[PDB]
C-alpha cells in the first residue's frame, strides 16, 4: 500500500523512541550538570550571565541562574524546576542537588550500555536513597538552641555563607539575621513568615553597614518639608482614609436649589476639616499613618498643629507599621481614640547625605514585631546578590527554628553516606548491588566536585580523607573546607542543615527515577 | 448494504449508508443530477424509507430511454407509452395489495410491521431496535389527534453497547440543578416563562434617594418583596420550580430556606414539549398558577447514567406525551447511523 | 463568478497568470519552421551540379553573385591546406616557436615520452587528426629536450598556445587515461579549446 | 461533457481500501505497545505552546495526539469511550482492537463476507460476557473491612502499570480512607485537589476537613489570631464593601446637612453588617464575593478571621464539610445555620500559606495536598489518583474483578477456542483468529518486560487447559504465577465493556466500502 | 570535567556559553577596553573626550569625569 | 446607487467605479446660478442622525438622501436597484419603517442591505471569519458564516477608545501634569495615535519602562512634552484588555469572543477558526495582533489552532464589500422588490415563516 496520511500533518513530524532517546537524554543532561558545577557548596566560584532584556545577575544561588536561561531542551527546563523547588524548600544545595543528580545519570548512563532495563536502575536508586537518608538521620547530631545562646547559630550562618561572597565580614550578618528571628519568630506556632521583614538594599556604604534595624524603614519625606525633622517617642495612629470629606461610594447628585446652600456648603466644607482636626488632635496621638494622601489644607493645619503625618503610604508598609507598633487600625474617626494608638520609640529623618532620596526610619523603645534589614554595598548587583544570600540565611534559620537540623556537611556527609550505601549494598544479592553501588559512586561525586572546585589535588585527597574516616568512624573529618589543614571537622564545624541535603537526596533520586522512563519521544 | 464514509467540505466525517443522507452528503454539479437528487429528496419527504429505489428505477428508465431513442424513435410516442404504462401500473398495483395492517397497537405486531424497514438498515439485530422502537411508539399512541414525530425524543449517551440502551417516558436534558435538594417523588411543578429575577420593567427604571431611611430599609424591603412573591409561589405547593430567563439567588436561596427544587431550562422547544407532556401552562408572571395550568409528575430526579448527569423528568405511570430513548454507543457515527434507522421506522409507522 | 469580481478589485488570489509562455514558445517554434526552406539555396555547393532537380529559373544575379562568393570562399579555405604531418621540431629552436608562430594560427603544442601505449596512442590520433586539419600547427618533441629534467609521470600533456597565451590545457594522462581514448573525443576535446567547429554525441 | 461531481474527490475502493484500513489502525498501537502492565512505560509529546506531557494511559495521549482518519478518529472515539465508561486498560483495548484487525488480514485478501465476520463478532462477544458473568469473582465477606482492603488491593493494581507503584499500599489505605469516609452517592466534584511544589510522595497528604490556597489579603492582614480550639464558620455569598447600592440610586438633595447623612448612613449599613456578624459568635468569615478592607479592619479589631472572593468550589465543599449553611444575606444568621469546627488556623507548607480546619464531626469529603518535584510527575500522580477513585467507585457497587497480568486473555482465548471446534465453516476461522488476538495481549506485556513468551505461553496453554485460572505472568521476576493470589487485580467490568466495544469497533470498520474527499471550501 | 555543547543543541536561538579561558579573555577585553577608555583621562593632568550620540540631533556634551561617559556608551 | 451611509459620511459612486465621486461632510457650481448652492448648503446644514449604531432621526436622512443624489449623483434611482449601508444593530422596526419611506418617495423597483461587518469581511475576501466590530462608542462581535450574519450571535460591549482615552487622563492626573481641556483631549490621542503599543503585558512593559528606563520616548512636540517614561503609553492599551484598569470590573473581551464563538456547533467554529479577521475603530498599534493571540490561546485548546488577521487600512472596507456584492451577479435572488413590497407590506421582511 502506498504510504497515506494517518497522522495529522506527518510531514514535519519527528519521533525519536529507544535507547538513542535515553542517550539523548543523559547526554544533555551530563552537558547541564557540568555546566553547573564550580559552584559547589561551602566553596566555590560564580557564574555571571545575561538575560533578555540585558541585565547583569551573577551568583552561586543556582536556581536563579537556571531560572534565567533561555534554554531549549525539556530535561533542563525540568532541572530547573527542580532547582526552584529546592530552593524554595531549604536555599543550599541549589548545585548540589542538580550536580548529584547529574552523577545519578552518569552512573545510569553506564550502566545502561550494560543493557539492563531501566526499572532496575530506579529501583536501586530508591532503595540507595532509602539507606542514605536513613543514616543520614541517625548521623545528624541535635543541637539545643535556646533564646539566649547564639554562638552556634552564628557558625552556622557563617559556615553556610561560604562560597557566598557575603562572607566578607563573614560574622556580623550571622548575629544580625538570629537576631531578626528571635524579634520575628513565632514561637508556639513555630512560624516565621518573611512577609515581616522588609528586606532592603541602596547602593554605595559596605558590606560592614549590613545592620538590622529593630523597627520599621519608610521611604517618604514630609508632607510639610520645613516641618521639624525629629521627634523622640511618640504616639501614632493609622487612619485607613484621607483627610477629604466623607463622599459615598455610590454615585451621587448634590443639588444646590439656593444661594444659601452654596454658604452652607462652603462652610461644611472647612467645617469638617477643623472638626477633623480637632478630632485626631484629641486623641493626643504625635503621628498619623495614611494610605490615600489628603489635601494640602491638612498639611497646614498640621503645621499649625505641630503634629507630624504622612501620605500615599502603601497597603503592606501600612501593616507592617501597625505590626510593629502594637495597635489596631483605625477605619475613621468614629474609631479614634487614646487606647488603640501605637507607642513610637523614635523615628528620625534621612537622606543619605549626597543623595536626595528621603527615609524615615522608626526603632521602637518598647516590643516589637516586624524587623527591618538594610544593604550597603558596591552596585545593584552587591545589593541582589545580599538580599537573595541572606534571605536563603533566614530560609535556613526557619529550618532551624527546630532541634537536630544540622549535620556536619562540607561533604563529608557525602563520603559517609557513601560508606553506608556501599556497606549495606555489598550484603546484598545480584542485579542490585551495580545500581546501589551506582548511587555510592554518585554520592562520593560531591566532595571530587569539591576538591576540584577548591584547586586541591583531588583523588589523593578524597583518598587519604576517605581512609581516615573510615579507620576511625566521625562524622567529622570532611575536607579542607578552609584549606588549612584540620580535616577534623569538629575543628573547623561546617555546621549546615540536615533537611537540607534530605531534601536534596530525596529530589534527586525521585527526579533521576522520573527521567530514567521517558523512552519514547515526540517533536513537530 | 455497505456503509459509505463521506467527508464533507465542512470535514464532518459522514458515515452514511442511508442513500438520502448519502445524497444529502454528495455535492454533484450535473443539472440532471440536481433533477434525480431533488425527487429522492421529495419521495424520502414523503415516505422516507429506500430512497435508492427510486435512483435505481430512474436510471433503469433512463438507460431504457437511451436504447430504444438511439434505435430511432422519436420522443412523443414512447412518452405516451412510458404514460400508458404508469397509468396501466397505477391502475394494477392496488390489486396487488396482499394484507393490511390491523388495529397499530399490538406490541409485536408493530413491531414486526416495523423490522422490515428496519433491516434495510443494520442486520445484526433488528428486532432490539424493534422492540425498543414499538415500546416507545406504542405508548404514545394518539386516539383522535395525529400523530407526530416530534412527540418523540432522542438521547444519546457515549459508552458502553446498545444493548445496555432502554426508553424513557419523558424527557431527559443536559444539565444540574442548581437546588440543594435532589430527589423528589411526585413534586408539583411550576413552569414558569418570565426571567425569574424581580420583573425588570421594560422602560429605563431608576432608583431616587433623598434621606437616609430611604437606603436603610431599600434592601431590607426589596428582600422581603422578593420573599413575598416566593412564599406565595411556594404556597401552591409546588416542589419543583421550572424558568428559562435569567435567574435571581436570592430566590435560590429562599427555595432554600424552604427546601425547593429548581431547574433551568434553555430551549423554548424544551418548554413546549414539556409543557405538552405535563399539562403545565408557560406563566407570562411568577404569581402561582391553579391547580388546573400545572403539570403533575411522578417522580423527578437528577439521575446518573454513566458518568453522564442529566436531569430527569420521569412518570411511573408512563402515559405522558413524549418519550424519549437512552443511547449508548461507543461512538457519535453509531449514533447517527442508529437514529437515522429509528427515524425510517418512525416514518414507516 | 466571486473570483472574478475579485480580479476585477483586487488581485489577492493568483489564477490568471503564466498562460503567455507557452503562447510566446509555441509562436516562436512555428517561427522557427521557415529556416529550413530560407536557407535552401543558401547553403549546398554542388546546387549547380544538382541541375534538373534544383532549377526552377536563373535570376542571374544573386545566383551568379552566389557562385562568386562561393568560389572566393572555397580559394580562401583552400589556401590554407598545407599541415597533415606531425612534425619533430628541436629544443634548441624551441623558443622561435613558442612565440613566433604566427598570429591567428592555433598551435597544439604536444610533449611526450614515447613507449607507453597512452603517450603512443595519443601520437597516433593526432597523426590521424593532422589528416583532416591541415590548418592546425601540430608539434611533437621529447619533453627532456624541450623543458630540462621534465618529470615523467606528467605525460602526456597537451598545450594549447597561440601568441604565447596558454588557452587550454590537457595536463598528463589524467585527462585521456585509458586505451578506450578515440579518435573523435581527441578532436571533441580540440573543438573545445576553441579551435575546432564540429558536432560530436559526447 | 461535464463532470458529474465537484472538482477535488477522491474514489478507492475494494479490498485496497480495506486492507488500507486495517494497516492503518495497526500503526497506532504499536506506538504504545509498551505501556501498561505493572512494567510501565512513559512517553513524552511536545506541541504548540511547548506544554509537555507524559502519560501510561494511551486514552489520555491520544487526546493530546490530533489525527485525521475515519479509522483512527474511530479508535479515538473508542478509546475514549472505554476511558469515560470504567477506565484504565484503554491502551488494552486499542491494542485488541489492531490485535482484531491485524488477525483478521487474509480474510479479507480471501473470499469472505463481512457478513459471516460480523456475525462471527457478535457470537463470539456475546459467549465471552455470558462466561465472563457465570465465573465472575465474588468475595461471599460482605463485610466493611473486607471490602476496604480488596479496594486497597485493586487501588495497587490500579497504580500497577502506573509511576507510583511503589507507594501503591499508601497511596491506596490513602483513596481508600478518603472513599470510605465518602457517603455512596458517588458524586465527583468533593473530592478537589491542593497541588504544592517540593516533597516527596509520601510528603502528600489527605486532609480530612478542607484545605485551600489563601487568596491575595487586603492590608492589615495576619493581624487576626492563628489558632482556634473550636472555632464557628460564617459562610458568605454577600460581599461586603463600601460600594454603590444599585447602580441607579440616583441623589438630589440640596441640603449638605442631608449629604452627609447618606454618607454616614452608608457607613451604618456597613457597620450593621459588621454587627450582626459580630453577634453569630462566629469567628471564621469566608466569601465567594469581595470584601473591603475596613471590613478587615473591623475583624483585626474584632480579633477573628476573614477571607472573601474565593472560588465557588471551595465555599461548597467547605459547606459539605462542616456542616454548616452558606447565607446570602446578613438578616437571618442563627446558631445552627453558621459552621463549626475543631481546630482552625492557616500553615506555612513548602512556601505558601493555606488554611485548614480539623476535628469536624462531619466526615464527608476530604482534599488532597500533593508534594511533589515534578509538575508532568504531579499531574500524573493527579490522573492516576483520578483512575483509582473511578476504579474504586466501580467496584463498590459490586466486586467484578479481575486478576492482572494479563492472564484474563488466556481465559478468554482458552474458552473461545474451545468453543471454536464444534462449529462449521469459516466461522471457526473467525472465532479463532478472535481467539489469537485475545491471546497476544500478554506476550506483549512480557516481551516488554524483557524475556521470551512462547515457552511460558505454552506452559500457560498447560495450566488453564485443565482449570488454571488467571496464573498470569510475573513482572520483575519473568515467570508465571496466579494474580489473583498475587493480588493485583483490575475491574471485571472494565475488560466486558473493552471486548464489547472492540466487537462494535470491529463490525462497524469491516463495514464500509469507499470513501469521497470534498474540495474543502 | 567541563563540556556543555558537544552532546545536543541546548540553547534556542541566540543563546551561547563559554567555560574555559575564553571567558576569562572576554571579559578582560572589555575591562581593559573600559581601562584605556578611562586611563586616558585621569589625573590633575587628566585629558578630555567628547560624547556623541547615534542619530537623533547627536547629543552633544563635554565632560572629563568618566561617570556619564560609562552612562552614556552602550557597554556590551 | 453604491451610496453607504457609513459611520459619519456617505459616499456615492457606482458599482463598477473604483470609488465614489463624491463625500459627505455632513464653489463648483456656485458662482454660475446658485440653484444647487442653497440646497447643498441646506443640506451640508442637516446633521448626522446615527450614534451607537442605532438611527435616531429619521426626516433627516431623507431629507439629505433626495438632494445627495438629485443635485449631483444625477440619477434616477425608479430605473434603479438601491444599495445603501445601515447601522450596525436595529430590530425589524427600523428597517421597516425605512422602507416604507424608501418605496413611498422614491418607489425604487428592489433593494437590499446588509451589515457593515458583512461588508468588511466581503472586502478582506473572506465569507467566513469573526471580526471584532470595535466601532467608535460601543464594540460588537459579528461571527459571519457564509455571508449572513446570525441573529442569536451579536454580542455587544460598551467599550470605546473614547473611554481609554479618558481612562489615560485619569491616570494622567496621577502623572503630574493632568490632560482634561480640548486641546489636551486632543493631544492625548494624538500621542494615542502616536505610541500605545503591546509587546506583552503590563507589569513587564512597565519593569522594562522604568527599571531599566529603555522604553522612554522623549515627546518633542508644540502641544507635547517629555512626560512619558514608556508607561502612558503602553497605559492607553491595558484598560483595552483588562477591564478592572477603568474601574467597571467584568470578563474581557476575549471572554465575550469566546462564548459567542463556543455557543455555536464546535464545526463551525472550525471555519471562524480559519480567518477571524480583526477590524479598527479603537485599534491602530500593533501589538495587538499576537497579543490577543496568545491571550485568547489561553482559551483555545492546544489541539486547535488558531489565526489572526489585520489589514492596514480599512477606511472604505464597507465600500468595497457593497461594490463587490453589487457585483455578486447571484444577490438579486435576494431582492425584495414591489412584487412583494405591494403584495405583503413589511410581512416577509418579518419572516413570518419559521
Request: hydrophobic content about 40%; overall charge negative.
Amino acid at each position: 500500500g502506498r504510504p497515506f496520511l494517518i497522522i495529522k500533518d506527518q510531514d514535519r513530524k519527528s519521533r525519536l523512541m529507544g535507547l538513542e532517546a535515553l542517550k539523548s537524554h543523559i547526554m544533555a543532561a551530563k552537558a547541564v550538570a557540568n555546566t553547573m558545577r564550580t559552584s559547589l557548596g561551602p566553596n566555590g566560584l560564580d557564574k555571571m550571565m545575561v538575560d533578555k532584556d540585558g541585565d547583569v545577575t551573577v551568583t552561586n544561588d543556582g536556581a536563579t541562574i537556571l531560572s534565567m536561561m533561555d534554554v531549549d531542551h525539556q530535561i533542563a527546563k525540568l532541572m530547573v524546576e527542580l532547582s526552584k523547588s529546592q530552593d524554595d524548600e531549604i536555599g543550599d544545595g541549589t548545585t548540589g542537588v542538580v550536580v548529584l543528580a547529574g552523577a545519578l545519570l552518569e552512573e545510569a548512563e553506564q550502566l545502561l550500555d550494560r543493557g539492563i532495563h531501566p526499572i532496575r536502575i530506579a529501583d536501586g536508586y530508591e532503595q540507595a536513597a532509602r539507606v542514605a537518608i536513613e543514616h543520614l538521620d541517625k548521623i545528624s547530631d541535635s543541637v539545643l538552641v535556646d533564646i539566649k545562646d547564639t554562638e552556634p547559630l552564628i557558625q552556622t550562618a557563617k559556615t553556610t555563607l561560604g562560597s557566598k561572597v557575603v562572607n566578607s565580614c563573614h560574622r556580623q550578618m550571622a548575629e544580625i539575621a538570629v537576631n531578626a528571628v528571635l524579634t520575628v519568630a513565632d514561637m508556639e506556632r513555630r512560624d516565621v513568615d518573611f512577609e515581616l521583614i522588609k528586606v532592603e538594599g541602596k547602593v554605595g556604604g559596605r558590606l560592614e553597614d549590613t545592620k538590622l534595624i529593630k523597627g520599621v524603614i519608610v521611604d517618604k519625606d514630609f508632607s510639610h518639608p520645613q516641618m521639624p525633622k525629629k521627634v523622640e517617642d511618640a504616639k501614632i495612629a493609622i487612619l485607613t482614609c484621607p483627610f477629604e470629606p466623607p463622599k459615598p461610594k455610590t454615585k451621587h447628585k448634590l443639588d444646590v436649589t439656593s444661594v444659601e446652600d452654596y454658604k452652607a456648603l462652603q462652610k461644611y466644607e472647612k467645617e469638617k476639616f477643623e472638626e477633623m482636626i480637632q478630632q485626631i488632635k484629641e486623641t493626643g496621638a504625635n503621628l498619623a499613618i495614611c494610605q490615600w494622601g489628603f489635601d494640602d489644607e491638612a498639611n497646614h493645619l498640621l503645621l499649625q498643629n505641630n503634629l507630624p503625618a504622612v501620605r500615599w503610604v502603601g497597603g503592606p508598609e501600612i501593616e507592617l507599621i501597625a505590626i510593629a507598633t502594637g495597635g489596631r487600625i483605625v477605619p475613621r474617626f468614629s474609631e479614634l481614640t487614646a487606647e488603640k494608638l501605637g507607642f513610637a520609640g523614635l523615628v528620625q529623618e534621612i537622606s543619605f547625605g549626597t543623595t536626595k532620596d528621603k527615609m524615615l526610619v522608626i526603632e521602637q523603645c518598647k516590643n516589637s514585631r516586624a524587623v527591618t534589614i538594610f544593604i550597603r554595598g558596591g552596585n545593584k548587583m552587591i545589593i541582589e546578590e545580599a538580599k537573595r544570600s541572606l534571605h536563603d540565611a533566614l530560609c535556613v534559620i526557619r529550618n532551624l527554628i527546630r532541634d537536630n537540623r544540622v549535620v556536619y556537611g562540607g561533604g563529608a556527609a557525602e563520603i559517609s553516606c557513601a560508606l553506608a550505601v556501599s556497606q549495606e549494598a555489598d550484603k546484598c544479592p545480584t542485579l542490585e548491588q551495580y545500581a546501589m553501588r551506582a548511587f555510592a559512586d554518585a554520592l562520593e561525586v560531591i566532595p571530587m566536585a569539591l576538591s576540584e572546585n577548591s584547586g586541591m589535588n583531588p583523588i589523593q585527597t578524597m583518598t587519604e580523607v576517605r581512609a581516615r574516616q573510615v579507620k576511625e568512624m566521625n562524622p567529622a573529618l570532611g575536607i579542607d573546607c578552609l584549606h588549612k589543614g584540620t580535616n577534623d571537622m569538629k575543628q573547623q564545624h561546617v555546621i549546615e542543615t540536615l533537611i537540607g541535603k534530605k531534601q536534596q537526596i530525596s529530589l534527586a533520586t525521585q527526579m533521576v527515577r522520573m527521567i530514567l522512563k521517558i523512552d519514547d519521544i515526540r517533536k513537530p | 448494504g455497505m456503509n459509505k464514509m463521506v467527508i464533507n467540505h465542512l470535514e464532518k466525517l459522514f458515515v452514511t449508508n442511508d442513500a438520502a443522507t448519502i445524497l444529502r452528503e454528495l455535492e454533484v454539479q450535473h443539472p440532471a443530477a440536481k433533477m434525480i437528487v431533488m425527487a429522492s429528496h421529495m419521495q424520502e419527504q414523503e415516505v422516507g424509507d429506500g430512497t435508492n429505489f427510486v435512483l435505481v428505477f430512474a436510471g433503469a428508465l433512463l438507460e431504457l430511454a437511451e436504447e430504444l431513442l438511439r434505435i430511432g424513435l422519436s420522443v412523443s410516442e414512447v412518452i405516451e407509452g412510458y404514460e400508458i404504462a404508469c397509468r396501466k401500473a397505477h391502475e394494477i398495483l392496488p390489486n396487488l395489495v396482499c394484507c393490511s395492517a390491523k388495529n397499530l397497537r399490538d406490541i409485536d405486531e408493530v413491531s414486526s410491521l416495523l423490522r422490515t424497514s428496519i433491516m434495510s438498515k443494520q442486520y445484526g439485530n433488528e428486532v432490539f431496535l424493534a422492540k425498543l422502537i414499538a415500546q416507545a411508539c406504542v405508548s404514545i399512541f394518539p386516539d383522535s389527534g395525529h400523530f407526530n414525530v416530534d412527540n418523540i425524543r432522542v438521547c444519546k449517551i457515549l459508552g458502553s453497547g446498545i444493548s445496555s440502551s432502554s426508553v424513557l417516558h419523558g424527557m431527559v436534558f443536559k444539565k444540574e440543578t442548581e437546588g440543594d435538594v435532589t430527589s423528589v417523588k411526585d413534586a408539583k411543578i411550576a413552569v414558569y416563562s418570565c426571567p425569574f429575577d424581580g420583573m425588570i420593567t421594560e422602560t429605563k427604571g431608576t432608583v431616587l434617594i433623598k434621606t437616609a431611611e430611604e437606603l436603610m430599609n431599600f434592601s431590607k424591603g426589596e428582600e422581603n418583596l422578593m420573599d413575598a412573591q416566593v412564599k406565595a409561589i411556594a404556597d401552591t405547593g409546588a416542589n419543583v420550580v421550572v424558568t428559562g430567563g435569567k435567574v435571581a439567588d436570592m430566590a435560590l436561596h429562599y427555595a432554600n430556606k424552604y427546601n425547593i427544587m429548581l431547574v433551568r431550562l434553555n430551549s423554548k422547544w424544551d418548554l413546549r414539549r414539556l409543557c405538552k407532556t405535563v399539562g403545565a401552562t408557560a406563566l407570562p408572571r411568577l404569581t402561582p398558577p391553579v391547580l388546573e395550568e400545572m403539570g403533575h409528575c411522578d417522580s423527578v430526579y437528577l439521575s446518573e447514567v454513566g458518568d453522564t448527569q442529566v436531569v430527569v423528568f420521569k412518570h411511573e405511570k408512563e402515559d405522558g406525551a413524549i418519550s424519549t430513548i437512552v443511547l449508548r454507543g461507543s461512538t457519535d457515527n453509531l449514533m447517527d447511523d442508529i437514529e437515522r434507522a429509528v427515524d425510517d421506522g418512525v416514518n414507516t409507522f | 463568478e466571486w473570483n472574478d469580481i475579485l480580479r476585477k478589485k483586487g488581485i489577492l488570489p493568483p489564477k490568471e497568470s503564466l498562460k503567455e509562455l507557452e503562447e510566446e514558445a509555441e509562436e516562436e517554434q512555428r517561427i522557427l519552421q521557415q529556416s529550413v526552406v530560407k536557407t535552401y539555396e543558401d547553403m549546398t555547393l554542388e546546387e549547380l551540379e544538382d541541375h534538373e532537380d534544383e532549377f526552377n529559373e536563373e535570376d542571374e544575379r544573386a545566383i551568379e553573385m552566389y557562385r562568386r562568393r562561393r568560389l572566393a570562399e572555397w580559394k580562401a579555405t583552400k589556401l590554407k591546406n598545407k599541415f597533415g604531418e606531425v612534425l619533430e621540431i628541436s629544443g634548441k629552436d624551441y623558443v622561435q616557436e613558442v612565440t613566433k608562430a604566427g598570429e591567428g594560427l592555433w598551435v597544439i603544442l604536444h610533449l611526450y615520452k614515447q613507449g607507453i601505449p597512452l603517450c603512443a596512442l595519443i601520437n597516433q590520433h593526432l597523426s590521424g587528426l593532422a589528416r583532416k586539419f591541415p590548418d592546425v600547427k601540430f608539434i611533437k618533441a621529447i619533453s627532456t629536450t624541450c623543458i630540462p629534467n621534465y618529470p615523467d609521470r606528467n605525460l602526456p600533456t597537451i598545450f594549447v598556445y597561440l601568441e604565447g597565451d596558454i588557452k587550454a590545457q590537457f595536463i598528463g594522462p589524467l585527462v585521456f587515461g585509458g586505451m578506450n581514448l578515440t579518435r573523435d573525443e581527441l578532436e571533441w576535446k580540440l573543438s573545445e579549446s576553441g579551435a575546432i567547429m564540429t558536432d560530436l554525441e559526447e | 461533457p461535464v463532470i458529474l461531481l465537484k472538482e477535488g474527490t477522491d474514489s478507492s475502493q475494494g479490498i485496497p481500501q480495506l486492507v488500507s484500513n486495517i494497516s492503518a489502525c495497526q500503526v497506532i498501537a504499536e506506538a504504545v505497545r509498551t505501556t501498561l502492565g505493572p512494567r510501565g512505560m512513559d512517553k513524552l509529546i511536545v506541541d504548540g505552546r511547548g506544554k509537555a506531557t507524559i502519560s501510561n494511559d494511551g486514552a489520555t495521549i491520544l487526546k493530546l495526539l490530533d489525527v485525521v482518519h475515519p479509522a483512527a478518529k474511530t479508535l479515538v472515539d473508542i478509546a475514549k469511550s472505554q476511558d469515560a465508561e470504567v477506565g484504565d486498560g484503554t491502551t488494552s483495548v486499542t491494542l485488541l482492537a489492531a490485535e482484531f484487525l491485524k488477525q483478521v488480514k487474509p480474510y479479507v485478501e480471501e473470499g469472505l463476507h463481512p457478513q459471516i465476520i460480523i456475525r462471527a463478532f457478535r457470537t463470539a462477544t456475546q459467549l465471552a460476557v455470558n462466561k465472563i458473568k457465570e465465573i465472575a469473582v465474588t468475595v461471599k465477606k460482605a463485610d466493611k473491612v473486607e471490602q476496604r482492603k480488596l479496594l486497597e488491593k485493586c487501588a495497587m493494581t490500579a497504580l500497577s502499570s502506573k509511576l507510583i507503584s511503589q507507594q501503591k499500599a499508601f497511596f491506596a489505605k490513602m483513596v481508600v480512607d478518603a472513599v470510605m469516609m465518602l457517603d455512596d452517592l458517588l458524586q465527583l466534584k468533593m473530592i478537589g485537589i491542593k497541588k504544592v511544589q517540593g516533597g516527596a510522595l509520601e510528603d502528600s497528604q489527605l486532609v480530612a476537613g478542607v484545605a485551600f490556597k489563601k487568596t491575595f489579603s487586603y492590608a492589615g492582614f495576619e493581624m487576626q489570631p492563628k489558632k482556634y480550639h473550636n472555632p464557628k464558620i460564617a459562610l458568605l455569598n454577600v460581599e461586603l464593601e463600601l460600594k454603590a447600592e444599585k447602580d441607579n440610586a440616583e441623589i438630589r438633595v440640596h441640603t449638605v446637612e442631608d449629604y452627609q447623612a447618606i454618607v454616614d448612613a452608608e457607613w451604618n449599613i456597613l457597620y450593621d453588617k459588621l454587627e450582626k456578624i459580630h453577634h453569630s459568635g462566629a469567628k471564621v468569615v469566608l466569601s465567594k464575593l469581595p470584601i473591603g478592607d475596613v471590613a478587615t479592619q473591623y475583624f483585626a479589631d474584632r480579633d477573628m478571621f476573614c477571607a472573601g472572593r474565593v472560588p465557588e468550589e471551595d465555599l461548597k465543599r467547605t459547606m459539605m464539610a462542616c456542616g454548616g449553611s452558606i447565607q446570602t444575606s446578613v438578616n437571618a444568621l442563627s446558631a445552627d445555620v453558621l459552621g463549626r469546627c475543631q481546630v482552625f488556623e492557616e500553615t506555612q507548607i513548602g512556601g505558601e500559606r493555606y488554611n485548614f480546619f480539623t476535628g469536624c464531626p462531619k466526615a464527608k469529603t476530604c482534599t488532597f495536598i500533593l508534594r511533589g518535584g515534578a509538575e508532568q510527575f504531579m499531574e500524573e500522580t493527579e490522573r492516576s489518583l483520578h483512575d483509582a477513585i473511578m476504579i474504586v467507585r466501580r467496584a463498590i457497587k459490586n466486586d467484578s474483578v479481575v486478576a492482572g497480568g494479563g492472564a484474563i486473555e488466556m481465559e478468554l482465548s482458552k474458552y473461545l477456542r474451545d468453543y471454536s471446534r464444534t462449529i462449521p465453516g469459516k466461522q471457526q476461522l473467525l472465532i479463532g483468529a478472535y481467539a489469537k488476538a485475545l491471546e497476544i495481549i500478554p506476550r506483549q506485556l512480557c516481551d516488554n518486560a524483557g524475556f521470551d513468551a512462547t515457552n511460558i505461553l505454552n506452559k500457560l496453554r498447560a495450566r488453564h487447559a485443565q482449570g488454571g485460572t488467571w496464573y498470569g505472568v510475573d513482572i520483575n521476576n519473568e515467570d508465571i504465577a496466579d494474580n489473583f493470589e498475587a493480588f493485583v487485580w483490575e475491574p471485571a467490568m472494565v475488560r466486558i465493556n473493552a471486548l464489547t466495544a472492540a466487537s462494535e469497533a470491529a463490525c462497524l470498520i469491516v463495514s464500509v466500502d469507499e470513501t469521497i474527499k470534498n474540495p474543502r471550501s | 570535567a567541563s563540556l556543555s555543547l558537544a552532546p545536543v543543541n541546548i540553547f534556542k536561538a541566540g543563546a551561547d556559553e563559554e567555560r574555559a579561558e575564553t571567558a576569562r579573555l572576554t571579559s578582560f577585553i572589555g575591562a581593559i577596553a573600559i581601562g584605556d577608555l578611562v586611563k586616558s583621562t585621569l589625573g590633575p593632568k587628566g585629558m578630555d573626550k567628547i560624547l556623541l550620540s547615534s542619530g537623533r540631533d547627536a547629543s552633544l556634551m563635554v565632560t572629563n569625569d568618566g561617570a556619564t561617559i560609562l552612562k552614556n556608551i552602550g557597554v556590551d | 446607487l453604491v451610496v453607504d451611509n457609513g459611520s459619519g459620511m456617505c459616499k456615492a459612486g457606482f458599482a463598477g467605479d473604483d470609488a465614489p465621486r463624491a463625500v459627505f461632510p455632513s464653489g463648483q457650481k456656485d458662482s454660475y446660478v446658485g440653484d444647487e448652492a442653497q440646497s447643498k448648503r441646506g443640506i451640508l446644514t442637516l446633521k448626522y442622525p446615527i450614534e451607537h449604531g442605532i438611527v435616531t432621526n429619521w426626516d433627516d436622512m431623507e431629507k439629505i438622501w433626495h438632494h445627495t443624489f438629485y443635485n449631483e449623483l444625477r440619477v434616477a434611482p425608479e430605473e434603479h436597484p438601491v444599495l445603501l449601508t445601515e447601522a450596525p444593530l436595529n430590530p425589524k422596526a427600523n428597517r421597516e419603517k425605512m422602507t416604507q419611506i424608501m418605496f413611498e418617495t422614491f418607489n425604487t423597483p428592489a433593494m437590499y442591505v446588509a451589515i457593515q461587518a458583512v461588508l468588511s469581511l466581503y472586502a478582506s475576501g473572506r465569507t467566513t471569519g469573526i471580526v471584532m466590530d470595535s466601532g467608535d462608542g460601543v464594540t460588537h462581535t459579528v461571527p459571519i458564516y457564509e455571508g449572513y450574519a446570525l441573529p442569536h450571535a451579536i454580542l455587544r460591549l460598551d467599550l470605546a477608545g473614547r473611554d481609554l482615552t479618558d481612562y489615560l487622563m485619569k491616570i494622567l492626573t496621577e502623572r503630574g501634569y493632568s490632560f482634561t481641556t480640548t486641546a489636551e483631549r486632543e493631544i492625548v490621542r494624538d500621542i494615542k495615535e502616536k505610541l500605545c503599543y503591546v509587546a506583552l503585558d503590563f507589569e513587564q512593559e512597565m519593569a522594562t519602562a522604568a527599571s531599566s528606563s529603555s522604553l522612554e520616548k522623549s515627546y518633542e512636540l508644540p502641544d507635547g512634552q517629555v512626560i512619558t517614561i514608556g508607561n502612558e503609553r503602553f497605559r492607553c492599551p491595558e484598560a483595552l484588555f483588562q477591564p478592572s484598569f477603568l474601574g467597571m470590573e467584568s470578563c474581557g473581551i476575549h471572554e465575550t469572543t469566546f462564548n459567542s464563538i463556543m455557543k455555536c456547533d464546535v464545526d463551525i467554529r472550525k471555519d471562524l477558526y480559519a480567518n477571524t479577521v480583526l477590524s479598527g475603530g479603537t485599534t491602530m498599534y500593533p501589538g495587538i495582533a499576537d497579543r490577543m493571540q496568545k491571550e485568547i490561546t489561553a482559551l483555545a485548546p492546544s489541539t486547535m489552532k488558531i489565526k489572526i488577521i489585520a489589514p492596514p487600512e480599512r477606511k472604505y472596507s464597507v465600500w468595497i464589500g457593497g461594490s463587490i456584492l453589487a457585483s455578486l451577479s447571484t444577490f438579486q435572488q435576494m431582492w425584495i422588490s414591489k412584487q412583494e413590497y405591494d403584495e405583503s407590506g413589511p410581512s416577509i421582511v418579518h419572516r413570518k415563516c419559521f
